[PDB]
Amino acid sequence: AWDYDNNVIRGVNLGGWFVLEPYMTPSLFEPFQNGNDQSGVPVDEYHWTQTLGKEAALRILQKHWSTWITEQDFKQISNLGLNFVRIPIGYWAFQLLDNDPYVQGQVQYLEKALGWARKNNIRVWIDLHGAPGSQNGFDNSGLRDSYNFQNGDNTQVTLNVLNTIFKKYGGNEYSDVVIGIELLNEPLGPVLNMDKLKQFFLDGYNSLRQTGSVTPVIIHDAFQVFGYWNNFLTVAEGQWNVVVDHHHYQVISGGELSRNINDHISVACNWGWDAKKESHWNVAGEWSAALTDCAKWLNGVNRGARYEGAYDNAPYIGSCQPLLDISQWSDEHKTDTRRYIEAQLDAFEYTGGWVFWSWKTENAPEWSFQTLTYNGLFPQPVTDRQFPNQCGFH
């Protein structure tokens, strides 16, 4: 239902929908603040649902699920010339561990979204964004500061959840809409056993194909160097319809944040050159317009911004307050943002395409496709260039 050789993905993530992320929907977390004291704010969905209990969690989440993304969003996405969405979902939508605080119900809306996608000629990846015990310790896995995916029976539970996803969404019923199942979002390579992670990817690959599914398998790069995956799941070995998902940001360290705009652009262009050398189909499954980490709680609940020297011993670069509202941005910051967006688009269109993180946020403009588009910073149509040919690809 997609030609990965000839077509280019132009998509957005539907983030914050089925996995809560505080920086994306701060209104769900802010009621737990005690004045300026954030010490009692739950840091992730795990603790949010635990603190509320099953009844309050389900009431609040049903309202969230039913309003955050609707059919009208899918219409707008198509109208903007996008052809694709990536849908993050956590393991808990399908299976709970004993004593898990999570609530269920997300699958109902997942299936509505697949229909809305069909109706609007939009293709989809389903992405297992959170595994039991956490594969990365990020709040976007469900469970912050824990790295237990490879401990105990957590890997086997994850495979069982994937098998459910394979039987439901990897078959004939959705073969016109689903163009990939992503086995696991952002496993944190440096802290994991890479041999065991490869075995997990292979087991998921084989399990899906054994169901009779021809659906592409999407593997996240696990924060490895470009080309690391060139020799894994290869046509030589009879393994086929495999896509590598690279995520690209320049806001996670002080070194990245202190780069001037020209050096930001050079790094973006190089993402394109280097992805082109790889032997698998590859798609930039996450990226954004952010040149700062100023969005409230981007680094986590009760953590500040490296950009203003408020976290992790980072030096002060600039004040975040002026950058929280896009109406307050200087002309220079707007121009830098537009340049950066265009450079990334050119780099990512040089291989399989791109998937912006994310469609919408409550009030974080660097991270909202909608906000950037309405303010003229994201090209519309997406092929428009005010800064043509920054990278010089051929």
**CA 152 to chain CA mean position, Å:** 27
Q: 10 Å Cβ neighbour count for 95?
A: 15
Q: CB of 161 within 8 A of CB of 101?
A: no
d(C-alpha 219, C-alpha 129), whole Å: 12
Q: CB of 93 within 8 A of CB of 103?
A: no
Three-state DSSP class for residue 245: strand
Residues 6+ apart with CB under 8 A from 162: 128, 181, 183, 204, 207, 208
For strand 353-356 and strand 178-182, is the pairing parallel, antiparallel, or unpaired? Answer: unpaired
Record the tokens describing residue 282, joined without a space: 């590859």
Q: What is the secondary structure of 189-234 as a DSSP string?
A: GGGS-HHHHHHHHHHHHHHHHHTT--PPEEEE-TTPPTTTTTTSS-
In eight-state DSSP terms, residue 391 is S
In our burial notation (b when 16+ CB lie closer than 10 A, e otherwise), range 224-254 reads eebeebeebbeeeeeeebbbbbbbbebbeeb
d(C-alpha 90, C-alpha 13), whole Å: 14
46 known ligand binder: no
- Structural domains of the chain ordered from first start: 1-394 (3.20.20.80)
Residue type present at position 328 = Q
Three-state DSSP class for residue 161: helix
Alpha helix (H) residue ranges in the chain: 45-67, 71-79, 106-119, 154-169, 194-210, 254-257, 261-276, 331-349, 369-374
d(C-alpha 44, C-alpha 50), whole Å: 10
Burial of 344 (C-beta count, 10 Å sphere; 0-12/13-18/19+):
buried
Q: CB of 182 within 8 A of CB of 245?
A: yes
Q: CB of 190 within 8 A of CB of 251?
A: no
Q: Which of 182, 186, 308, 366 is catalytic?
A: 186
Residues 6+ apart with CB under 8 A from 313: none
* Elucidation method: X-ray
DSSP run (H or E) holding 90: strand 84-90
Q: CB of 286 within 8 A of CB of 300?
A: no
Q: CB of 281 within 8 A of CB of 234?
A: no
Q: Which of 45, 182, 286, 342 is catalytic?
A: 286
Known catalytic membership, residue 286: yes
249 known ligand binder: yes
d(C-alpha 209, C-alpha 219), whole Å: 15
Residue type present at position 223 = F
Q: CB of 387 within 8 A of CB of 339?
A: yes
Known catalytic membership, residue 173: no
d(C-alpha 346, C-alpha 73), whole Å: 25
Resolution in angstroms for this experimental structure?
1.9
Of the candidates 117, 114, 157, the one whose C-alpha atom is nearest the C-alpha of residue 133 is 157
380 phi, psi to nearest 5 deg? -145, 115
d(C-alpha 42, C-alpha 50), whole Å: 9
178: which strand partners? 124
186 known ligand binder: yes
Sign of CA dihedral 268, 273, 278, 282: positive
Residues 6+ apart with CB under 8 A from 53: none
349 known ligand binder: no
d(C-alpha 19, C-alpha 118), whole Å: 23
Residue type present at position 343 = A
What distances in angstroms separate CA 25 from CA 21, 40, 63, 158, one per listed residue?
6, 17, 13, 27
**CA 105 to chain CA mean position, Å:** 21
Of the candidates 113, 110, 101, 182, the one whose C-alpha atom is nearest the C-alpha of residue 142 is 101
Of the candidates 121, 128, 39, the one whose C-alpha atom is nearest the C-alpha of residue 85 is 121
Of the candidates 274, 277, 2, 229, the one whose C-alpha atom is nearest the C-alpha of residue 121 is 2
Sign of CA dihedral 359, 27, 300, 17: negative
179 phi, psi to nearest 5 deg? -110, 15
23 known ligand binder: yes
Record the tokens describing residue 289, joined without a space: 């317009």
Q: CB of 298 within 8 A of CB of 22?
A: no
